[PDB]
Ligand binder design. Structure first.
Ligand SMILES: CC(C)CN(C[C@@H](O)[C@H](Cc1ccccc1)NC(=O)O[C@H]1CO[C@H]2OCC[C@H]21)S(=O)(=O)c1ccc(N)cc1
Ligand SMILES: [Cl-]
Ligand SMILES: [Cl-]
Ligand code: NA
Lengths: 99, 99
């Protein structure tokens, strides 16, 4: 699609067998999801934004379906106030900003 | 232009006669820039990101060039780690997300 920015660019994702809503966020380097279980190994990470840092679990090689488009990559899991799809996965679905 | 997301989508802005770099950020409702002087009165605002909230100064009807496009609108000033152009001004320059 072409998604205008009058409202938050929310999309449906599928991750870990679960359907969720997430924000397409060009200002996020990494994808960060609210607490949930994911399979395999993880390692701890700190990520920072406005407000400061939160501690997250970094899971690699996670498949996510984003608006119907499959992508694989790193997913960070932790106490984010919103599920955010970052550039690491947006590149994989061919997302661009146009003006 | 068409901006891919392999790198941070940084653009040049001009505000108060000064060039700055800023991030086109679809996950930001609001434009928030690092401390600087702007004309007129400001109003209080709290914004919440990853990390928690911060207090900012809200300036309305500020003239700002973004990647060579004129916008006039609300600019928040506060301790953001990076200058961020949010949806409020990205809509003024006609930006969309496409995939
Ligand atoms: C501040 C940016 C440089 C970085 N952020 C992404 C940004 O899009 C967040 C993403 C976001 C969105 C909602 C809540 C928390 C974080 N937006 C944000 O803080 O926007 C604030 C300004 O406008 C407001 O509208 C949204 C909250 C306000 S971040 O959420 O801190 C972040 C940092 C690292 C990663 N990997 C992923 C996300
Ligand atoms: Cl990745
Ligand atoms: Cl590409
Ligand atoms: Na893994």
């Amino acid at each position: 699609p072409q998604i205008t920015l009058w409202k938050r660019p929310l999309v449906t994702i599928k991750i870990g067998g679960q359907l969720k809503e997430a924000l397409l966020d060009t200002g996020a380097d990494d994808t960060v999801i609210e607490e949930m279980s994911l399979p395999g190994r993880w390692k701890p990470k700190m990520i920072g934004g406005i407000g400061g840092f939160i501690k997250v679990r970094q899971y690699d090689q996670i498949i996510i379906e984003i608006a119907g488009h499959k992508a694989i990559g790193t997913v960070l899991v932790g106490p984010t106030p919103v599920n955010i799809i970052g550039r690491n996965l947006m590149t994989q679905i061919g997302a661009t900003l146009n003006f």
